[PDB]
Amino acid sequence: RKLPEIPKNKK
Amino acid sequence: RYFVAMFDYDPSTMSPNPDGCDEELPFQEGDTIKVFGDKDADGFYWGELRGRRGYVPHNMVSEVE
């Protein structure tokens, strides 16, 4: 089961 | 066993997993999540928020320290 991407515009 | 969400997470629109909505917890930044045990091989905590339990990705949350 795969980890989500941290939104780049929030990071 | 408390973790703080560093980002918003809406599994319905953001999960890379096909069962994400049904199995993963939704949260917004600053939510405090109750974690039981340790993070699994996939990198997910088993957690509780607002009367619901589900998988929580470790990279979206920070342990209270």
Residue numbers in the entry:
A (entry chain M): 153 to 163
B (entry chain A): 1318 to 1382
Task: Please share excerpts from the published article on this structure.
RBP, via its second and third SH3 domain, is known to bind synaptic ligands such as Ca2+ channels and RIM. Drosophila RBP SH3-II and -III share 49.2% sequence identity and adopt the canonical fold of SH3 domains. We observed the classical poly-proline helix that allows for mainly hydrophobic protein-peptide interaction in all three structures. In summary, we find that the SH3-II and -III interaction surface of RBP serves as a multi-functional platform for differential protein interaction with either other AZ components or the transport adaptor and therefore, motor-cargo linkage.
